[PDB]
Amino acid sequence: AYTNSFTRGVYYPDKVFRSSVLHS
Amino acid sequence: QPTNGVGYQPYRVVVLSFELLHAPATVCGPKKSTNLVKNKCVNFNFNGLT
Ligand SMILES: *[C@@H]1O[C@H](CO)[C@@H](O)[C@H](O)[C@H]1NC(C)=O
């Protein structure tokens, strides 16, 4: 049995402060 | 054997791996802190970040 994830499961990839930025 | 050729003798090994992350430092050399300074042009070093 299943359901959809939508956009769950994103996490802070690194231990750095960044602000107002479209990082990749 | 104590009389093996050197290529066949036993050797002891240690390998040190260093965790250079932007996490908090916890293993550091014999370096010493100054007082902090603010609002003035300074040379600085934080945990080895010069
Ligand atoms: C994913 O779930 C939907 C129903 O929400 C279903 O139609 C689809 O076949 C499912 N696909 C997979 C690969 O599970």
Swiss-Prot record, chain A:
Source organism, top-level taxon: Viruses
Subunit note: Binds to host ACE2. RBD also interacts with the N-linked glycan on 'Asn-90' of ACE2. Cleavage of S generates a polybasic C-terminal sequence on S1 that binds to host Neuropilin-1 (NRP1) and Neuropilin-2 (NRP2) receptors. Interacts with host integrin alpha-5/beta-1 (ITGA5:ITGB1) and with ACE2 in complex with integrin alpha-5/beta-1 (ITGA5:ITGB1). May interact via cytoplasmic c-terminus with M protein. May interact (via N-terminus) with host bilirubin and biliverdin, thereby preventing antibody binding to the SARS-CoV-2 spike NTD via an allosteric mechanism.
Function: Attaches the virion to the cell membrane by interacting with host receptor, initiating the infection. The major receptor is host ACE2. When S2/S2' has been cleaved, binding to the receptor triggers direct fusion at the cell membrane. When S2/S2' has not been cleaved, binding to the receptor results in internalization of the virus by endocytosis using host TFRC and GRM2 and leading to fusion of the virion membrane with the host endosomal membrane. Alternatively, may use NRP1/NRP2 and integrin as entry receptors.
Protein name: Spike protein S1
Shown chain mapped onto the complete sequence: 27 to 50 of 1273
